[PDB]
Design a protein around this ligand. Structure first.
Ligand SMILES: [Fe+2]
Length: 820
């Protein structure tokens, strides 16, 4: 006669219970096996919640269980979906429906707003997995209609309760109606400025510029992309807006009123920040102390002091960051371990036009270098010469950056030698400037070599700082923002638009998108906006985001695969006799060696899951959702690069495995490796400066005399000033923290995400393999033979690719997704 059901939900004041009974909430079951005269599954009667189930012992925090009984004869078939209407004023979060007598499970995890706000009734499917040709016939039209609903029609201002996924260009960063100084180029949709697309918000044009989107208080994301949290301390993504809008002005007032020194005077004034702290005006502590997320960043006496946490890089030695050993080691085991390249000729060459920038020949001479007794030909031939090459990347921007008040940079190149002991050593830095006919500046390019004593040691320490300003900027805008956050969002949007929640590839990929659209929208509002966090703390100021567009011109999807990246950079060679198919040229390269282990584990998982759903190549060709998904992801999401010959075609099993593997790698391990080291390495501003403010001084000036007499002040005058340091330390502290509700690689948010037992078994094997790999990585960190590259003189074991972590600022753990 009746099917016993249990509804689990969370009332809004968690992310009383009697209000959900009576006629507050109705469900209707939908048949998967019996259809009406139009081929659509039969729908049951409106059925209301009957009472509160207090008998389950199992429920997670903030959740409540409700009993319900559905009238359903065997003639109606087997339920495969349900409709739900909320007649209450306030939305609730629907977790699940379970039907008994064998069991039928529905994983929902979705906000359900009042019924009058929706243009069609909310629908949820059971947890079975189907490619389109395997959809039971009575569900085929419901499946397609739900995808049409998610796509919308490309027009209208998006509202909080909307679940509409679509694309737009980055035209929402400028604020020209406030000032012409805050106008910014549109990024995307032109040859001049190609860029990934972002989620459409639809607020409409500014009054002064029809091509720029007006400001708004809330930047929309489709509703279920905006993750609630049980603990407000876990809402880390809200910290950037509080930092830009509340905390930053408060810091500014303490400086404007001359209540704290304007500049750091000595390195000890920087160390003080995590020791005794900084003293600020009472009203400034009182502004900062009570805000969620922000209040966790500092310890305080409640009256005048803020104290930052001690960064990992200084926990054993406060001075080791200054060693040449640590500067080079951080290129293979630091915050940004993926830019170094092999160098197979000498001198290094440039592809830029000498008619624009002047002669681009390198002025580093082979004979000046100390290669531990090797000749240059011997170092080149044995594959011991490497570089960190920012010359061609930065040179096109140097003139415009250097015209800003308080910014001055060089376009840098660093030469590295792989010693016989297996560590890297820096051997030269070239500090380059553009030159043209009528230039007003007399500053010249120069080469600086290592030195441990005298004024030459200060010049070398400053040369390292100019390199790390280039590296910091490239890390933040390109390795981190462009290659993870921005590159991924088009694939999120395409997946929801074209793959049904039923689809096996939706189930494979979507855990890897958790919180990504949300943190991106908050970033467009407060991180990468005109006058936002990055522009006010990093070297390029108003040129920062457009630099990332220039770099995107040479972004290649298939070169994001780890083996292809290593081969392209000349840090590994193809070798089919090896287990990973590549031979590393730096044997103990911690990022790459650990990374290959994680890459192989993801590859085995994808290669076991795909054949569960696709028997042959033509099964991939003939999946219409998959074909529409991939066509749109390329031609619209990354559409400014649609003309490029390197995009996989998606007509084979091999191509489907490859595309999925690359997406999962980018979202999980690549993002973790470039994100969770930000405060551990960069929490000491001298180790990771964000900006440089002057060029090297001329002999015979007061600034030159200061390098001799007060080297720490010379350094501190060159790098990021105190006020932007306070703001930038605060933001990287937030971004380096794991929320306690994170879902890590090898985990899913629900154990019943599919009913397919073979898929569940494959996923278990994947999780066990990641535990086995963590044991191996622990043995590598405990191997004294690997100390030089894995720990360095900072004595900081490389744990950034350990799969697991507890909450907090832990320097380890791989989330599924780009979640912060
Ligand atoms: Fe991130």
């Amino acid at each position: 006669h009746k099917i016993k059901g249990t509804v689990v939900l969370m009332p809004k004041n968690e992310l009383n219970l009697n209000a959900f009974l009576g006629r507050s909430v109705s469900l209707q079951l939908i048949s998967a096996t019996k259809a009406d005269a139009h081929g659509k599954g039969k729908v049951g009667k409106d059925t209301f919640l009957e009472g509160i189930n207090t008998s389950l012992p199992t429920l997670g925090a903030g959740e409540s269980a409700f009993n319900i009984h559905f009238e359903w004869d065997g003639s109606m078939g087997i339920p495969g979906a349900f409709y739900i209407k909320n007649y209450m004023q306030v939305e609730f979060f629907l977790k699940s429906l379970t039907l008994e007598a064998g069991t039928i499970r529905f994983v929902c995890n979705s906000w359900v707003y009042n019924t009058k706000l929706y243009k069609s009734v909310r629908i949820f499917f059971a947890n079975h997995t189907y490619v389109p040709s395997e959809t039971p016939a009575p569900l085929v039209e419901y499946r397609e209609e739900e995808l049409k609903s998610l796509r919308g029609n490309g027009t209208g201002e998006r509202k909080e309760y909307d679940r509409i996924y679509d694309y737009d260009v980055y035209n929402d960063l400028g604020n020209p109606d406030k000032s012409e100084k805050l106008a910014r180029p549109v990024l995307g949709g032109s040859s001049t400025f190609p860029y990934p697309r972002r989620g459409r918000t639809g607020r409409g044009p500014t009054v002064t510029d029809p091509n720029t989107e007006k400001q708004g208080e809330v930047f929309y994301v489709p509703r279920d992309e905006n993750l609630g949290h049980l603990k407000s301390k876990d809402a880390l993504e809200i910290g950037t807006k509080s930092l830009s809008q509340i905390v930053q002005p408060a810091f500014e007032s303490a400086f404007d009123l001359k209540s704290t020194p304007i500049e750091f005077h000595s390195f000890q004034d920087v160390h003080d920040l995590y020791e005794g702290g900084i003293k600020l005006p009472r009203d400034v502590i009182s502004t900062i102390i009570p805000l969620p997320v922000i209040k966790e960043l500092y310890r305080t006496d409640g009256q005048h002091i803020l104290k930052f946490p001690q960064p990992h890089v200084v926990q054993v030695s406060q001075s080791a960051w200054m060693t040449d050993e640590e500067f080079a080691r951080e290129m293979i085991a630091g915050v940004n371990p993926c830019v170094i390249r092999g160098l197979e000729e000498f001198p290094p060459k440039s592809n830029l036009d000498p008619a624009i920038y002047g002669d681009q020949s390198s002025k580093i001479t082979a004979d000046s270098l100390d290669l531990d007794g090797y000749t240059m030909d011997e170092a080149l031939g044995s594959r011991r010469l490497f570089m960190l090459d920012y010359h061609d990347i930065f040179m096109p921007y140097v003139r415009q950056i250097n015209q800003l008040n308080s910014a001055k940079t060089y376009a840098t190149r660093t030469i590295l030698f792989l010693r016989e002991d297996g560590t890297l050593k820096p051997v030269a830095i070239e500090l380059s400037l553009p030159h043209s006919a009528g230039d007003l500046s007399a500053a010249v390019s120069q080469v600086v070599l290592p030195a441990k004593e005298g004024v030459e040691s200060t010049i070398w320490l400053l040369a390292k700082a100019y390199v790390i300003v280039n590296d910091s900027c490239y890390h933040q805008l390109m390795s981190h923002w462009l290659n993870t956050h921005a590159a991924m969002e088009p694939f999120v949007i395409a997946t929801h638009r074209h793959l049904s929640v039923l689809h096996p590839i939706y189930k494979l990929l979507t855990p890897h998108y958790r919180n990504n659209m949300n943190i991106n929208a908050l970033a467009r509002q407060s991180l990468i906006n005109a006058n936002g966090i990055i522009e006010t703390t990093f070297l390029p100021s108003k040129y920062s985001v457009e630099m990332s567009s220039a770099v995107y011109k040479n972004w290649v999807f298939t070169d994001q695969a780890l083996p292809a990246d290593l081969i392209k950079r000349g840090v590994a060679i193809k070798d089919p006799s090896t287990p990973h198919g590549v031979r590393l040229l730096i044997e103990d390269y911690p990022y790459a060696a650990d990374g290959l282990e994680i890459w192989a584990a993801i590859k085995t998982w994808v290669q076991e899951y795909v054949p569960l759903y696709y028997a042959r190549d033509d099964d991939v060709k003939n999946d219409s959702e998959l074909q529409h998904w991939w066509k749109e992801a390329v031609e619209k999401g990354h559409g400014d690069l649609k003309d490029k010959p390197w995009w996989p075609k998606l007509q084979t099993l091999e191509d489907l495995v490859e595309v999925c593997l690359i997406i999962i790698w980018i979202a999980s391990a690549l993002h973790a490796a470039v994100n969770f080291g930000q405060y551990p390495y960069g929490g000491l501003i001298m180790n990771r400066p964000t900006a440089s403010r002057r060029l090297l001084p001329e002999k015979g000036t007061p600034e030159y005399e200061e390098m001799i007499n007060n080297h720490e002040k010379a350094y501190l005058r060159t790098i990021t000033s105190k006020l932007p340091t306070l703001i930038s330390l605060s933001v990287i502290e937030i971004l380096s923290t794991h929320a306690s509700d994170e879902v890590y690689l090898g985990q899913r948010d629900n154990p019943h995400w599919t009913s397919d037992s073979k898929a569940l078994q494959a996923f278990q094997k994947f999780g066990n393999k990641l535990k086995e790999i963590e044991e191996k990585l622990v043995r590598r960190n405990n191997d004294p033979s690997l100390q030089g590259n894995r720990l360095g003189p900072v004595q900081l074991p490389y744990t950034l690719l350990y799969p697991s972590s507890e909450e907090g600022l832990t320097f380890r753990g791989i989330p599924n997704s780009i979640s912060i």
